[PDB]
Amino acid sequence: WVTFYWHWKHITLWQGNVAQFNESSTYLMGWLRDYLWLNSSQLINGYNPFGMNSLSVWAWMFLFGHLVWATGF
Partner 1 sequence: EVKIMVEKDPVKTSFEKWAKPGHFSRTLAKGPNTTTWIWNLHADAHDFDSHTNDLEEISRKVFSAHFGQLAVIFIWLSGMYFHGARFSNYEAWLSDPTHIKPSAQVVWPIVGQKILNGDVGGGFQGIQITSGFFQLWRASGITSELQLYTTAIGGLIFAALMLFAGWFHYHKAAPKLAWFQNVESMLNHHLAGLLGLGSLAWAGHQVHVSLPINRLLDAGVDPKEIPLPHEFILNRDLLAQLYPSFSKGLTPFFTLNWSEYSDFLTFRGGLNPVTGGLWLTDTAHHHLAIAVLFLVAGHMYRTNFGIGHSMKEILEAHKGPFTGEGHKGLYEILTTSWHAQLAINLAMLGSLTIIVAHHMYAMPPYPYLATDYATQLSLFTHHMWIGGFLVVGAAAHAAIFMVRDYDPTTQYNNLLDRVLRHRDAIISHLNWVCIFLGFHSFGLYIHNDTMSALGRPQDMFSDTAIQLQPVFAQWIQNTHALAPSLTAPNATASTSLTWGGGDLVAVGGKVALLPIPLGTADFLVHHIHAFTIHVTVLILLKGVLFARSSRLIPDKANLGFRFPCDGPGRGGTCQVSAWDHVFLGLFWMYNAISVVIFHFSWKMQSDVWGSISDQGVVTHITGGNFAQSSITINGWLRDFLWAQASQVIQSYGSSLSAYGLLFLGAHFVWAFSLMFLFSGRGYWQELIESIVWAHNKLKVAPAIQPRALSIVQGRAVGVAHYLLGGIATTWAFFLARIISVG
Partner 2 sequence: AWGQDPLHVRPIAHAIWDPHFGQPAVEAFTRGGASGPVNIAYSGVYQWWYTIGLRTNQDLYGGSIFLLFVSAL
Partner 3 sequence: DVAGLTPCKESKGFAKREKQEIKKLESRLKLYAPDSAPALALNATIEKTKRRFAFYGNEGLLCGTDGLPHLIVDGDQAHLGEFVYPGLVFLYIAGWIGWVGRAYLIDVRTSKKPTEKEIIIDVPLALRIMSKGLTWPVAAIGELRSGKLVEKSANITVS
Residue ranges that bind partner 3, judged by CB under 8 A: 19, 22-23
Size of the site for partner 2 (CB under 8 A): 5
26 binds partner 2 (CB under 8 A): no
User: CB of 24 within 8 A of CB of 34?
Assistant: yes
61 belongs to the binding site for partner 2 (CB under 8 A):
no
If one asks whether residue 4 binds partner 1 (CB under 8 A), the answer comes out as no
* Footprint of partner 2 on 38-57 (CB under 8 A): 51-54, 56
Query: How far is the CA of 51 from the CAs of 43, 45, 46, 62, 69, in angstroms?
Result: 14, 10, 9, 18, 28
